[PDB]
């Protein structure tokens, strides 16, 4: 339906300008006969998920690279795509006038937007909060009689999540993660720095902590919200580093194991919330395969772990094949999920760069690498930030796909939002990654998937400056002659019968 309104802030590409009366959006999804494909194209030059169609022909006029769909080569099924409703994202969204809020929510959650079906939710304060708090701040309340939700949940987070879910087509899955416990459960009695739970797994501190998860799930369920899954702790390794500035809670891989086996696993299993899944790690892939070896070789722990959550931030330090591929080799039945799909992004640049094509490219390149290394799901960090990359009570280092200007009742959809959308919009939950063979060495990032109804989706990323002639073969349909322009991303979609 409505086109992108471009604006330049002096970076390599444009943002799309939205406000209370206008946002760029899509017509309800509509797909052509066998023999025809749809192509969605974004370019550095300014095109934004622009749709064209053409033929899938019986004869091959391409003399360059060929990608061949191999539907009989079948891999992981996809859980999905989303981001995080941090207090910072909620405050930024709620600083818009209500009709602008809806245009923002539709942008992410509607079929007329990009089809998000996962929301990550922090269990209390993190660095993207304006203040420190947990749900049980009164000391020595080991039965947690004074557990409650603040304004942050009941006023900002929960309403925005209800509104996301009304907007969404697909069922949305909720994922929760803790940053810190009550500080009276901690060896350092502080929200941050080097500090663990007091005592040992099995004790009163660890039982109380495990019970807090259940209290949180009960509280959200009073608000008629249920969780797909919880992670065992956000960035547990951060809590082992002295002076760590953000909310945290240290677990060694061994402590995580024992806490799971002794406390979190049995407590959740013993609650009415026993269908909620558990993801271990929620941290840098550099920590793999080790962390998974420690936790998952102990069957009293492993029986409670459904998946392994990873963060992207420090990916450049550790190859996908050594970490993700190696972990899959060893525990092929434990899913890999990107719970904090965020990098960012060069000590000599600002937090937020409006219209950065490069940061876009980094998102899609990273989703593609993940997909080729068995990852089933991706949750971006903050849904929305202000232009200084906040609020953050400690310090901003990261960009966001939507940047909200609260002085102008306007929001900016960054190139990152469209790189994401090239995946989230066209890869519904249950989609299976399938084979896609390059005929010769090339510079493109490419992946193929089959929808639950058997139709084909292919994304092609060109991170070079130069146009690449391309043919895509489907053995069941024919050849698709196309071109990958320099600095573009294409999503191709087609019926297979
Ligand atoms: C919102 O954006 C639309 C599209 O540019 C524009 O025509 C309208 O003037 C905007 N509203 C305000 C208050 O700027």
């Amino acid at each position: 339906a409505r086109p992108c309104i471009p604006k330049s802030f002096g970076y390599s590409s444009v943002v799309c300008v939205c406000n209370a009366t206008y946002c760029d959006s899509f017509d309800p999804p509509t797909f052509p006969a066998l023999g025809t494909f749809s192509r969605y194209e974004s370019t550095r030059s300014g095109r934004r998920m622009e749709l064209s169609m053409g033929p899938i022909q019986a004869n091959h006029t391409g003399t360059g690279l060929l990608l061949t769909l191999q539907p009989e080569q079948k891999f992981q099924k996809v859980k999905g795509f989303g981001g995080a409703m941090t207090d910072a994202a909620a405050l930024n969204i709620l600083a818009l006038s209500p009709p602008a809020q809806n245009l923002l929510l539709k942008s992410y959650f509607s079929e007329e937007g990009i089809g998000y079906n996962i929301i990550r939710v922090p269990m209390a304060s993190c660095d993207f909060s304006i203040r420190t708090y947990t749900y049980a701040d009164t000391p020595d309340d080991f039965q947690l009689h004074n557990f409650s939700l603040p304004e942050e949940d009941t006023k900002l987070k929960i309403p925005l999540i209800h509104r996301a879910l009304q907007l969404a087509q697909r069922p949305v899955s909720l994922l929760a993660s803790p940053w810190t416990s009550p500080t009276w459960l901690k060896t350092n009695g502080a929200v941050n720095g080097k500090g663990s739970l007091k005592g040992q797994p099995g004790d009163i501190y660890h039982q109380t902590w495990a019970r807090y998860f259940v209290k949180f799930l009960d509280a959200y369920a009073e608000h008629k919200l249920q969780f797909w899954a919880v992670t065992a702790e956000n960035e547990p390794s951060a809590g082992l580093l002295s002076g760590y500035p953000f909310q945290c809670l240290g677990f060694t891989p061994e402590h995580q194991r024992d806490f799971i086996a002794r406390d979190l696993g049995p407590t959740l299993a013993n609650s009415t919330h026993h269908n909620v899944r558990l993801l271990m790690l929620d941290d840098q892939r550099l920590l793999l395969p080790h962390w998974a070896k420690v936790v998952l070789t102990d069957p009293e722990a492993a029986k409670y772990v459904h998946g392994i959550a990873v963060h992207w931030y420090l990916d450049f330090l550790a190859p996908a094949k050594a970490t993700l591929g190696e972990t899959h080799r060893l525990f092929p039945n434990t899913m890999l999920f990107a719970s904090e799909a965020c990098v960012g992004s060069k000590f000599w640049e600002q937090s937020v760069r409006l219209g950065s094509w490069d940061r876009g490219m980094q998102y899609s390149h990273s989703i593609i690498t993940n997909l080729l290394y068995h990852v089933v799901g991706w949750t971006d960090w903050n849904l929305a930030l202000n232009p200084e990359g906040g609020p953050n009570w400690v310090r901003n280092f990261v960009d966001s796909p939507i940047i909200v200007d609260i002085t102008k009742d306007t929001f900016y959809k960054q190139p990152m939002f469209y790189h994401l959308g090239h995946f989230s919009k066209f890869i519904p939950e249950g989609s299976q990654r399938v084979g896609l063979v390059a005929s010769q060495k090339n510079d493109l990032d490419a992946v193929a998937l089959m929808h639950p109804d058997g139709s084909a989706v292919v994304v092609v990323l060109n991170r070079s400056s130069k146009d690449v002639p391309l043919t895509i073969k489907d053995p069941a349909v024919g050849f698709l002659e196309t071109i990958s322009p320099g600095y573009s991303i294409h999503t191709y979609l087609w019926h297979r019968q």
Side-chain angles (χ1 to χ4, degrees), residues 52 146 159 178 182 187 190 240 299 348 384 402 426 446 474:
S52 67
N146 305 315
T187 59
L240 311 166
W348 65 84
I402 289 156
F426 305 109
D474 194 331

Side-chain angles (χ1 to χ4, degrees), residues 5 19-22:
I5 310 285
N19 63 19
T21 59
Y22 191 98

Side-chain angles (χ1 to χ4, degrees), residues 2 5 17-23 408-410:
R2 319 234 250 187
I5 310 285
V17 190
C18 294
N19 63 19
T21 59
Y22 191 98
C23 201
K408 282 167 153 94
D409 199 32
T410 105

Side-chain angles (χ1 to χ4, degrees), residues 212-230:
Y212 185 100
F213 283 76
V214 169
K215 292 309 216 151
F216 168 78
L217 296 167
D218 299 338
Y220 262 63
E222 296 164 42
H223 293 266
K224 311 213 281 209
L225 285 177
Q226 334 299 314
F227 282 78
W228 154 62
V230 303

